[PDB]
Amino acid sequence: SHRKYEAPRHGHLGFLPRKRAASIRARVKAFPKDDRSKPVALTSFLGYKAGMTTIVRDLDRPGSKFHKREVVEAVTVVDTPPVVVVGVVGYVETPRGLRSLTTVWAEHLSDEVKRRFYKNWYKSKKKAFTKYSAKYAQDGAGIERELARIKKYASVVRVLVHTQIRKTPLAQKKAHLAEIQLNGGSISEKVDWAREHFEKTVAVDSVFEQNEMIDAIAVTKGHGFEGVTHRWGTKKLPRKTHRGLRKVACIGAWHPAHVMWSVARAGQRGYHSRTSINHKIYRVGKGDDEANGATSFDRTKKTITPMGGFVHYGEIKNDFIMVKGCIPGNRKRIVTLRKSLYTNTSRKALEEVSLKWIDTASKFGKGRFQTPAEKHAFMGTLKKDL
Amino acid sequence: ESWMER
Amino acid sequence: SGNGAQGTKFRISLGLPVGAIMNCADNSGARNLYIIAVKGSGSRLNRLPAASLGDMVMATVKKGKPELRKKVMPAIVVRQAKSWRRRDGVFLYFEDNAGVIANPKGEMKGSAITGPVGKECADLWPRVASNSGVVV
Amino acid sequence: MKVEIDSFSGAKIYPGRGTLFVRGDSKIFRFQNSKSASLFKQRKNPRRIAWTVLFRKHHKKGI
RNA sequence: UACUGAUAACCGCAGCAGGUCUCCAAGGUGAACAGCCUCUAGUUGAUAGAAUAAUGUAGAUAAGGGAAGUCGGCAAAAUAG
RNA sequence: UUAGUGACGCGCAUGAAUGGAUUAACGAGAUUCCCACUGUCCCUAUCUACUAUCUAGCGAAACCACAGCCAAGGGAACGGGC
RNA sequence: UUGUGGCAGUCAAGCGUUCAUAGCGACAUUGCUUUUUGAUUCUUCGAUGUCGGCUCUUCCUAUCAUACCGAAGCAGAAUUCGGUAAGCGUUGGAUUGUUCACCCACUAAUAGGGAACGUGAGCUGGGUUUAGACCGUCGUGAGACAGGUUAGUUUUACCCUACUGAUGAAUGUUACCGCAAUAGUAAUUGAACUUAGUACGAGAGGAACAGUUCAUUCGGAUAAUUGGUUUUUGCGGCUGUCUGAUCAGGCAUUGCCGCGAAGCUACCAUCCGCUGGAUUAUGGCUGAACGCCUCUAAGUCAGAAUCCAUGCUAGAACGCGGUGAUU
Ligand SMILES: [Mg+2]
Ligand SMILES: [Mg+2]
Ligand SMILES: [Mg+2]
Ligand SMILES: [Mg+2]
Ligand SMILES: [Mg+2]
Ligand SMILES: [Mg+2]
Ligand SMILES: [Mg+2]
Ligand SMILES: [Mg+2]
Ligand SMILES: [Mg+2]
Ligand SMILES: [Mg+2]
Ligand SMILES: [Mg+2]
Ligand SMILES: [Mg+2]
Ligand SMILES: [Mg+2]
Ligand SMILES: [Mg+2]
Ligand SMILES: [Mg+2]
Ligand SMILES: [Mg+2]
Ligand SMILES: [Mg+2]
Ligand SMILES: [Mg+2]
Ligand SMILES: [Mg+2]
Ligand SMILES: [Mg+2]
Ligand SMILES: [Mg+2]
Ligand SMILES: [Mg+2]
Ligand SMILES: [Mg+2]
Ligand SMILES: [Mg+2]
Ligand SMILES: [Mg+2]
Ligand SMILES: [Mg+2]
Ligand SMILES: [Mg+2]
Ligand SMILES: [Mg+2]
Ligand SMILES: [Mg+2]
Ligand SMILES: [Mg+2]
Ligand SMILES: [Mg+2]
Ligand SMILES: [Mg+2]
Ligand SMILES: [Mg+2]
Ligand SMILES: [Mg+2]
Ligand SMILES: [Mg+2]
Ligand SMILES: [Mg+2]
Ligand SMILES: [Mg+2]
């Protein structure tokens, strides 16, 4: 018979199977459509999520009740040390998809990146790219003809970059390596850009700019095996339920004599790869700079890092991206920042954002202070002091 | 022993 | 909101599900108001319609004048007592739940309001704003 | 933006931090934390709480 | 005429959380052989180790509302000398 | 408010030790409302111990024609087999 | 099977100021359905766990609302009829065990149904329908009563399959970067301001497109802040007892109380939720058939919450590629 009262499906079926991601680094399953007119640039970047903090800014939204008034907003910080370009590979179109024909690498690969090709680095002759590097040193023979092959073919071109993990406080020592598409023009110019940038570094200022909308692609926080209640948001059965209330009561009708795929079942929660779109950049900050956390209105020389450091991460001694709101992933997780795929005007993606203040108080508690000088002024001399 | 089918 | 609601209201946390008795802040002769409905409320299985500061609810009078009791009438919430976030970032709350009696287009039946009112309700109902002394 | 002062402790309140309590007499009490809010609700006096600015003033500590 | 007199000597198919008559009875708190702690005396027995997912059993806490839940205030809370 | 209470009564088929009508006190009896109280609920979340889990040792039972992917058809008119 | 129930047609005497068909439609007649109730007794009596509710999923369309349209006895506003459409939604409560019903209220709307009259090794057990007991009526009596009342044990999964997640041999080894067949897919609805007291209308009344700001339901994340949680048994305090006192502590099955970081977490907190093509209905172009006319027959334009892609989620463990090192 028919359901007594209507209600919607608990959960989204296009986010199935709610399984563990195949890797910890989510992969970009789509890059922005290429305009073969603009200069050569990366469509994405690699960074590590540090944490979240608090922002004040004056809103410019004509029609709202908070126009030209101060609002408080949550931002997330992504430590973005400059990536290092080691390699390109060309993709050509086929009736079975895009297919890579060649991958050209740089001559000198750094240890942190050739650690990505080992599961046991402490016991190895390290023997990686030791013949490919001797493929150089005869002027360009085995390399320039591969690049010319990529030029003659390869409607799509992607650069291999790796992270400078040693510049972060993470104790991982193993760089993340990724393919990032180039969306300039003239595949010859694409690959010449790559060749010139081999062994060289690319900063986030050359890729992202302020008030720009981006997508964050990351594997989300893991929570292990979870029951249907928190996994799907189903109703708790009442108190006097024998053999458990934290369940789904009916998991199907008699016919079809099967459990359907659309029925809420217990299982893995978290560690899914997620793409979250339209997160505005509120600041692109440099690491060759103090007063990273200063504004036009505060003007007190303080870095972006809170007192005591970002909890479970550390400092932001390198460059960073302050992006509005909440992005998938937890602290210390590799995040892939991607340019938007469509032009969103929207009267909200075009708002020019001018920050007024940045919270640099401790996140290890109820922080009263933003700076140790402020702490010292408020509290006075202590028994530790002289 | 259920006295129900009655 | 609705008929006499001049403007829009940013969301603020709901505290007053149907069944809630809140004090009456005006001088119409009613002491409390028993909420039986909320205007502008959605429909979800088992979800109780709940009201916040600024909402126009349907209410009865349980304690007060007999000519007001035993009948349904519109009311407006002016104090919540559950914390809600302003876009200024501050969370704020009163100590009691409080409403006033009104007509479906927002004109207050009484002439005064005892205690403070929320600026969110004052901006949404001008007859409330006129008869309100302190607005926070 | 303005930096406010805790009505109980005297601590500075930066934006988005703490709570605000409007009392029936229309008075506004700003709290930096649930600690001071809870002591207020427990009806404690700040002049007898040893970490409050008012205690330290009344006792001449760092004056 | 020894010995047990019972979470192992009795009866329950058994070294079963059941049942099975009675005597003696310290200090403190406190109305109190109540509950809680301790002295004398007696035990330290019950398969263990490593982890801390779901669902459970037992115990609990929860903003604002306050029986709108349910056949029904079932359960729990509140009260308590 | 198909509930409850108070009244009405041509009462299918009330009624007098088949006891009738009352009734203070009493009731782990059946019931309605009110105050208070609360995670019963809005709407869920979190913590603890013992489990489940993995290991060493020990080691059953129910049940069992053969066995175990589905749709339709027909068919003892709802098949795992056709 | 379909009498009965429900739904839909044909015809057109009439109603509708005039006027059969805007909307209705008698006398008659053709059918569909199987959510009614019956008829039947094919299966099941070496047992297929019956009412209802709670919970959860899917499906149908005979569409209540939402999108797009056609018609009117459509001036506007509101309403009625109809079409393509099941993509998305369809509530909270008083009484009743109820299905059903009836009222209150919100709502864009409170549409109908199926899935062994879905769903009891999923719950509950209020009712029905063992045994106790009361009443009324019937009965000489024992006892009877789809008459009423009260009390009345809801067992087992560790197996196969399915489902959710999780490993994994073999494709020379091992490692890294990738492709993308197939499967799934998601966003939804409303108000306010303005348009505008404008169009329309004698007046009364009274819109709409674009645009802006917000909100409803849903979903996916997140924990800066607020709140919750507290074996941080972290700090402090309190009781009783014990360690001669002090200090410092033990026990009270986490002794109690306040605060309480971290972590987890809440529409109780915050952020986010894409744009292109092909089409339905319908309206049209040219244009014959039928020297005229005709959206249609050839051909074609625009067009929906529709479909397919973009995008998003997995990645075939017998689908594939490129690269590194290869004792
Ligand atoms: Mg339905
Ligand atoms: Mg049903
Ligand atoms: Mg969630
Ligand atoms: Mg039970
Ligand atoms: Mg913190
Ligand atoms: Mg319900
Ligand atoms: Mg002897
Ligand atoms: Mg002897
Ligand atoms: Mg003896
Ligand atoms: Mg004895
Ligand atoms: Mg003895
Ligand atoms: Mg024996
Ligand atoms: Mg015997
Ligand atoms: Mg005494
Ligand atoms: Mg004695
Ligand atoms: Mg005693
Ligand atoms: Mg044992
Ligand atoms: Mg109910
Ligand atoms: Mg009699
Ligand atoms: Mg079959
Ligand atoms: Mg069989
Ligand atoms: Mg055969
Ligand atoms: Mg029929
Ligand atoms: Mg018929
Ligand atoms: Mg039969
Ligand atoms: Mg039978
Ligand atoms: Mg059998
Ligand atoms: Mg069965
Ligand atoms: Mg249809
Ligand atoms: Mg049937
Ligand atoms: Mg079943
Ligand atoms: Mg009986
Ligand atoms: Mg007789
Ligand atoms: Mg009978
Ligand atoms: Mg807290
Ligand atoms: Mg916390
Ligand atoms: Mg023409």
From Swiss-Prot, chain A:
Q: Where is it predominantly found? A: cytoplasm
Q: What happens when the gene is disrupted?
A: A mutant confers resistance to trichodermin, a trichotecene toxin produced by plant-pathogenic fungi.
Keywords of the record, alphabetical order, are: Cytoplasm, Isopeptide bond, Methylation, Phosphoprotein, Ribonucleoprotein, Ribosomal protein, Ubl conjugation
Family matches, as InterPro entries: L3_arc_euk (IPR045077), Ribosomal_L3_dom_3_arc_sf (IPR044892), Ribosomal_uL3 (IPR000597), Ribosomal_uL3_CS (IPR019926), Transl_B-barrel_sf (IPR009000)
User: What biological-process terms (Gene Ontology) are attached?
Assistant: cytoplasmic translation; maintenance of translational fidelity; ribosomal large subunit assembly; rRNA processing; translation; translational elongation
- The record places the cross-link (Glycyl lysine isopeptide (Lys-Gly) (interchain with G-Cter in ubiquitin)) at K38, K135
* Record's comment on post-translational modification: Methylation at His-242 by HPM1 is required for proper 60S subunit assembly and promotes translational elongation fidelity.
Q: Where is the PTM Pros-methylhistidine found along the chain?
A: H242
What would you give as a GO molecular function for this chain, any one?
RNA binding
Task: Give all Phosphothreonine modified positions.
Answer: T102
Sites where Phosphoserine occurs are at S23, S155, S296
Q: Where in the cell is it found?
A: Cytoplasm
Subunit relationships: Component of the large ribosomal subunit (LSU). Mature yeast ribosomes consist of a small (40S) and a large (60S) subunit. The 40S small subunit contains 1 molecule of ribosomal RNA (18S rRNA) and 33 different proteins (encoded by 57 genes). The large 60S subunit contains 3 rRNA molecules (25S, 5.8S and 5S rRNA) and 46 different proteins (encoded by 81 genes). uL3 forms together with ES39L one of the contact sites for the signal recognition particle that targets ribosomes to the endoplasmic reticulum membrane.
Q: Which family does it belong to?
A: Belongs to the universal ribosomal protein uL3 family.
Q: Report the protein name in the record.
A: Large ribosomal subunit protein uL3
Organism from which the protein derives: Saccharomyces cerevisiae (strain ATCC 204508 / S288c) (Baker's yeast)
Upper classification of the organism = Eukaryota, Fungi, Dikarya, Ascomycota, Saccharomycotina
Gene expressing this chain: RPL3
UniProtKB/Swiss-Prot annotation, chain C:
Which controlled-vocabulary keywords does the entry list?
Acetylation, Cytoplasm, Methylation, Ribonucleoprotein, Ribosomal protein
User: What is the recorded post-translational modification?
Assistant: Methylated by RKM1 at 2 different sites, but it is unclear which are the 2 methylated residues among Lys-39, Lys-105 and/or Lys-109.
> One of this protein's GO BP terms?
cytoplasmic translation
Which CDD domains does the record associate with it? Ribosomal_uL14
Matches recorded under PROSITE patterns? RIBOSOMAL_L14
* Compartments, as annotated in UniProt: Cytoplasm
Read off the PANTHER family from this record: 50S/60S RIBOSOMAL PROTEIN L14/L23, LARGE RIBOSOMAL SUBUNIT PROTEIN UL14
Recite the other comments: There are 2 genes for uL14 in yeast.
What function does this protein fulfil? Component of the ribosome, a large ribonucleoprotein complex responsible for the synthesis of proteins in the cell. The small ribosomal subunit (SSU) binds messenger RNAs (mRNAs) and translates the encoded message by selecting cognate aminoacyl-transfer RNA (tRNA) molecules. The large subunit (LSU) contains the ribosomal catalytic site termed the peptidyl transferase center (PTC), which catalyzes the formation of peptide bonds, thereby polymerizing the amino acids delivered by tRNAs into a polypeptide chain.
Assembly information from the UniProt record: Component of the large ribosomal subunit (LSU). Mature yeast ribosomes consist of a small (40S) and a large (60S) subunit. The 40S small subunit contains 1 molecule of ribosomal RNA (18S rRNA) and 33 different proteins (encoded by 57 genes). The large 60S subunit contains 3 rRNA molecules (25S, 5.8S and 5S rRNA) and 46 different proteins (encoded by 81 genes).
Q: What is this protein called?
A: Large ribosomal subunit protein uL14A
- Recorded source organism is Saccharomyces cerevisiae (strain ATCC 204508 / S288c) (Baker's yeast)
Gene designation: RPL23A
From Swiss-Prot, chain D:
Tell me which family the UniProt entry assigns to this protein: Belongs to the eukaryotic ribosomal protein eL24 family.
Signal peptide positions on this chain: none
Protein's organism: Saccharomyces cerevisiae (strain ATCC 204508 / S288c) (Baker's yeast)
- Recorded superkingdom: Eukaryota
Please name every pair of cysteines joined by a disulfide bond in this record.
Answer: none
Instruction: Look up the further comments and give them.
Output: Present with 247000 molecules/cell in log phase SD medium.
| Described function | Component of the ribosome, a large ribonucleoprotein complex responsible for the synthesis of proteins in the cell. The small ribosomal subunit (SSU) binds messenger RNAs (mRNAs) and translates the encoded message by selecting cognate aminoacyl-transfer RNA (tRNA) molecules. The large subunit (LSU) contains the ribosomal catalytic site termed the peptidyl transferase center (PTC), which catalyzes the formation of peptide bonds, thereby polymerizing the amino acids delivered by tRNAs into a polypeptide chain.
Phosphoserine modifications at? S7
| Compartments in which it is found | Cytoplasm
Q: What is this protein called?
A: Large ribosomal subunit protein eL24A
Give the record's subunit note. Component of the large ribosomal subunit (LSU). Mature yeast ribosomes consist of a small (40S) and a large (60S) subunit. The 40S small subunit contains 1 molecule of ribosomal RNA (18S rRNA) and 33 different proteins (encoded by 57 genes). The large 60S subunit contains 3 rRNA molecules (25S, 5.8S and 5S rRNA) and 46 different proteins (encoded by 81 genes).
